[PDB]
Amino acid sequence: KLVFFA
Amino acid sequence: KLVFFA
Amino acid sequence: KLVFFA
Amino acid sequence: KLVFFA
Ligand SMILES: O=S(=O)(O)c1cc(S(=O)(=O)O)c2c(/N=N/c3ccccc3)c(O)ccc2c1
Ligand SMILES: O=S(=O)(O)c1cc(S(=O)(=O)O)c2c(/N=N/c3ccccc3)c(O)ccc2c1
């Protein structure tokens, strides 16, 4: 599970 | 920018 | 720019 | 597997 906010 | 992967 | 999901 | 390059 990957979650990435940029 | 948002990236989700599962 | 490279993105690779395997 | 995840690969990122920039
Ligand atoms: O699924 S395949 O067998 O088709 C496969 C497998 C890999 S690999 O096993 O992750 O090695 C790569 C790969 N490697 N890319 C990395 C670069 C830097 C760090 C880690 C990995 C690459 O540059 C291009 C194509 C690939 C195809
Ligand atoms: O902070 S950075 O600007 O250096 C940056 C930028 C990106 S990126 O521009 O969104 O490309 C990524 C990234 N990309 N992830 C996607 C995967 C699938 C779809 C869309 C995007 C990733 O997997 C890992 C690290 C990253 C770091």
Residue numbers in the entry:
A (entry chain A), B (entry chain B), C (entry chain C), D (entry chain D): 1 to 6
What's the paper's own text on this?
Here we report the first atomic structures of small molecules bound to amyloid. These are of the dye orange-G, the natural compound curcumin, and the Alzheimer's diagnostic compound DDNP bound to amyloid-like segments of tau and amyloid-β.
The co-crystallization of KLVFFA with orange-G resulted in deeply colored crystals. At the interface between orange-G and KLVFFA, a total of 500 Å2 of apolar surface area is covered, corresponding very roughly to a binding energy of 9 kcal/mol, or a dissociation constant of ∼0.3 µM.
